[PDB]
Each structure stands twice: as structure tokens, then as C-alpha cells.
């Protein structure tokens, strides 16, 4: 049985993303170049079934944003209808971009200037991962919501594996969000217990009965930059050491997966 | 001008790697499956110049091991002689696999059993990133050599970029070593100053005048598992935030690089 993966994909280029602007809840479309960019992506990741075999895909999660949903269609173009029917696509609000608040639409340079004029960052420079965004999200808020996504996904993965099924789940979302996502997948940042009303409640971010909700004891958030680079159309491959869904890991993935019988990993413990 | 990348590739499958055995200085060849594995990889990475353009490759570093060297030839089969003449290949002893010492050739379960019989790991289970290997390397020793290779690589990157050249450097090495490499690339583990005689001296690990030696002030080593997965023939993409060689980053790399005019990244600071 194949080791499960969660394969994260940033939406294609939008106008703001190309220009360095922070795009959160603003619902921009893919630019023409962005479209072609995701069309060629899907083509390249499905080519001959070596990197991604549509038979092994169980779930595809998507941020509600247009740009992300557009990317789903475009990347999945090489699939047949038969292939598409076996796959569940779930819209999940937990997957949105960091809510930029006051900073929506701005450039870094501008954010710094705006904050400076407000008396902020007097001792150290702004750092979104620590500080979050005025009238937008703190690092804890996005850590939390991403953690519930992750736990849902890992839970599907465990059930699938335990059923003897291979399972590739995809996530199409955003630049800050996915870097964040991948950072906590493999253990960066800090563990915090779920205490406040927000930290405990079911905010109902998706509507799909076949995706069990995972009620978290605790969650993860970052306090600093994880140092990931993720351009539009960038892909990350998240997964597991020693076939153990308890040892989440970031995969340095080559163009094709080895069958378990041909894999090269040391044993656990 | 394009952001430089250090593209790390684990050697193809060997008989020991396939079976879970620790392969350090033992100089195994690729299995036939391994060869085919890296022939197909090279083809897939050079396919249409979108992921890797031979034009942009300046340096290829390789561990001295046979398996790594074999992989270099195999991955580069798609190249013309003209293309290969513009690329320098540098054998670097600093890029070898962790020296497993007493554990060479063994399996993890076997390592644990041997250590337990010696009275070790009485309070917590063996962890190589903290503990290293009996009559092999400490984590600090491999941290050190890897740090020297990185420093030399980032050095070339900076020079090439400052000369207005793109720069893709490849590194072909090993499972533990590469994960370790990527881990320190982007900031995991701990900074330690170079104090002891080993920590300061030039061990002369490669022989190529065109590669400047970098005399380190301090270096990095891990103290725990960075949680990367890296099969035989796996590939990671290391790089930089905001085109600043001062901000090393791991890239979640899609099938193709965007021209800087098409890239989607927030400004720095």
C-alpha cells in the first residue's frame, strides 16, 4: 500500500500576486498567463501517471477563493470523467489566505510605512508570522484554522491507509497559508492548547458529510518565518516517515513515486 | 536575472538502500532499477527546459561515492556535449553520507538492539541527529562539513548573481546528508562558533580552484529530526526569499520556474 500524501498547490497568478500585493479575501481571477500556467501544471503533474495517479486521489480541498477554484479546474483538465467521478472536491473556508485586514491590497513597503506612521514596530521590524495584521488575523488565528484542516486531512489519510487504500489528498490555496500549512505539517512553530471559545468551537468552514470533523485538544501556530518559497503554481509535497501517519514529514519529491517494494528508507524507532 | 537555486538530488537505488540498511562509506553501485530510476529522472527534469535549463547550470557538486557519481552521469544523459562543456562538476568529500561507524550496513532495529545491549539509550531512544554513531560521526561533525559546502555554494550564488548571471547548482549526495543539508539551508538546528582545531581547519575535501574556499566564523548542526522525507532519486529545491542570497529558503517548487517579471512574491523587509 502507498504512503499517503497531501499535495499542496498555490493558485495560478492573479494581477495582484504578480505585482507583490497582499491578496486575502479580495476575490481576484487568474490572469490569462496564470491560466496557461495552471493548464501546463496539470498536464505536467499527470503526465504518464508517474508523479500523480488520478486513481490514488481521494480528496481535493480548495480555499473558497475564485483563483484557487479556477486552478482546480485547470490542473484537473487531463482527467477523464470516470476519473473525476471517483474524486471528491471540498470547498473549505479554513483554507483561505491570511486575512490582511488594513493591509489588503498593499505592498510590503507600504505596510511598513503605514505601521511606522502609526507608531508601531518601534523596536523590531514587522513580521507577519509573529505579529499578524491590524483588523485581520493574528498568527494564532490562522495557525488554529489551518490545524483543523490538517487534522481532518490526516484523519482521512489514517482511515484510508488502515482500509488498505492509497490516498493522495490535494490542497489548492494560498502563498502565506500554504507555507504556514507545510510549516506545521512537519513540526515548526509552537503547540498551544485549545482554551478560548474560538479555540474550541466548530466554525463550520466546509459542508461535506464524508469529511469527519476533528475536535482539536491543542493546535499549532508559528511565531516566526518558516523560510519557504512558494510562487504562484508552486507545489509542495507533504507526507510521512516510515509509513507512519504519526510522523508527518515534508517530502523532497522527485518526479515519481517508488512502489513500497522499491522504496529506500531506514526502518523506524 | 533568475533567482539562483541549489537543487539537491539523492543518488539512485542501491541494494542496501532498498532494504533499509545504513549505507555510509560502503561504496555500493546503483541497482539496475536504480539506473533506470535516474535515467527517467534526468529526462523528466530536463524535459523542455521548463524545470531546469542546462544554460543556467553553473556547478554540479557530488559526494565521492560511486552511487552519487553514477547518478550524475545518468541524470545528465539528456545533455549535449556543448551543454556539458559549460558545466563544472566538482567531487566534494564534505558531501558524503553520515559515517555510520559501528552501524554500517545495519538496520535500525539492529542498531537499537546493539545499543541496548551496550547499556545505551537508557533514558530515551536513540536519535541519530542528536546522538550520531559509535565510531562514526557526531551530529556536530556532519553539521560542520555540510555547513562548509553550503557556504561555498551560497558564495558562488552571490558572485554569479552579482555578475548578473542566473545560477543553478546541483548537489548529488545521500539520504541523511541531504535532509541535513536542507535543514540547515533554511535555519533549522543550532548556530555554533568554530573553536576546536577541526572546527577551523581546511580539510581539503575537494580539488577545484574555481571553487573559492569559505573560512567559516561559525557553523550549523541539528539536535533533532528535521522531518524531511527523501527517497532514492528524491529531489529538493533550495533557494532564496526576495532574490536575497541573505535569506536562504526551501522552495516548494512546481514543474516550472516563472520569469522574474512573472513571479508572485511580496516585497522584502
From Swiss-Prot, chains A, B:
Decide whether keyword Nucleus is in the record. Answer: yes
User: Hydrolase: is it a keyword of this entry?
Assistant: yes
Please give the SMART domains that the UniProt record associates with this protein.
PGAM
Keyword terms: Carbohydrate metabolism, Cytoplasm, Hydrolase, Nucleus, Oxidoreductase
Q: What is this protein's pH dependence?
A: Optimum pH is 6.5.
Q: Which GO terms describe its cellular component?
A: cytoplasm; nucleus
Q: What does the record note about the induction of this protein? A: Expression is correlated with levels of ribosomal proteins, thus periodic SHB17 expression coincides with the peak demand for ribose phosphate that occurs during ribosome synthesis.
Result when mutating residue 179 to A: Leads to reduced substrate affinity
The record's subcellular location field reads: Cytoplasm; Nucleus
GO biological process, alphabetically ordered: ribose phosphate biosynthetic process
Give GO terms: molecular function aspect only: oxidoreductase activity; sedoheptulose-bisphosphatase activity
Q: Which domain of life is it from?
A: Eukaryota
Q: What effect is documented for mutating residue 100 to A? A: Impairs catalytic activity
| Reported impact of residue 176 to A | Leads to low activity and reduced substrate affinity
The record, for Pfam families, names: His_Phos_1
| Enzyme Commission (EC) number | 3.1.3.37
Q: Into which family does the record put it? A: Belongs to the phosphoglycerate mutase family. SHB17 subfamily.
Subunit details for this protein? Homodimer.
* Additional remarks: Present with 11500 molecules/cell in log phase SD medium.
Q: What is this protein called?
A: Sedoheptulose 1,7-bisphosphatase
Q: Which organism is it from?
A: Saccharomyces cerevisiae (strain ATCC 204508 / S288c) (Baker's yeast)
